[PDB]
Write a protein that binds this ligand. Structure first.
Ligand SMILES: CC(C)Oc1ccc2c(=O)[nH]c3sccc3c2c1
Ligand SMILES: [Zn+2]
Lengths: 162, 43
């Protein structure tokens, strides 16, 4: 694969700034927690740095291309991604298989500023049938995973919604 | 699908909601941090 996961200490400034982004970007959802569950905050169990040489160089190569098409501006963000396929993503990277075909904004890969938005997709679209163990979209027991991703936006098409 | 011509991404502009983003090429994202968590039942 080439992927290693490095555990961050809770004492590490990097752990604390990622936790704060996770906690501070929770909002209430219009489904009243149907898809992602009822909560105002998370119990953070672990934060791991994802290290893959090939996938990083794949990222930085594409970033330079976008940047050079956009007056030397990658327009790079740190955004949340929720998916049942997080394990495939950390090992093989994002591809066509991670696209949301039925997405409001077209068939592409979706990212959120709201951690609680990405949380709605960890067990699938609309939270699917919830956690595999309890069949509960609002399960307080089962361990969930989100990706906090470096995303090159370049020139972004502004779509107004609702 | 592809980006709208002359663009690299889509911004889904949201009262309290923050933005959602769409990229059409997987190379335009790197998964930096894997976060393991539980949602917490409110008090
Ligand atoms: C309008 C919609 O917005 C989103 C926002 C975030 C996400 C996400 O984090 N993961 C996945 S996986 C399939 C769809 C989505 C998704 C869709
Ligand atoms: Zn469960």
């Amino acid at each position: 694969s080439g992927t290693i996961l490095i555990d961050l200490s809770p004492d590490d400034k990097e752990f604390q700034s990622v936790e704060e982004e996770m906690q501070s970007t929770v909002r209430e959802h219009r489904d009243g927690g149907h898809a992602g569950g009822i909560f105002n905050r998370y119990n953070i169990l672990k934060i791991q740095k994802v290290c893959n040489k090939k996938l990083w160089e794949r990222y930085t190569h594409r970033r330079k291309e976008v940047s050079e098409e956009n007056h030397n501006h990658a327009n790079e963000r740190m955004l949340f991604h929720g998916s049942p396929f997080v394990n495939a993503i950390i090992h093989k990277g994002f591809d066509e298989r991670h696209a949301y075909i039925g997405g409001m904004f077209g068939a592409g890969i979706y990212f959120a500023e709201n951690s609680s938005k990405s949380n709605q997709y960890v067990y699938g679209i609309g939270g699917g049938t919830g956690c595999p163990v309890h069949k509960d979209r609002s399960c307080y027991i089962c361990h969930r995973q989100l990706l906090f991703c470096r995303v090159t936006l370049g020139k972004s098409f502004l779509q107004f919604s609702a | 699908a592809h980006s709208p011509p002359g663009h690299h991404s889509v911004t889904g502009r949201p009262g309290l909601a923050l933005a959602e983003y769409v990229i059409y090429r997987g190379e335009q994202a790197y998964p930096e941090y894997l976060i393991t968590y539980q949602i917490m039942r409110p008090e």
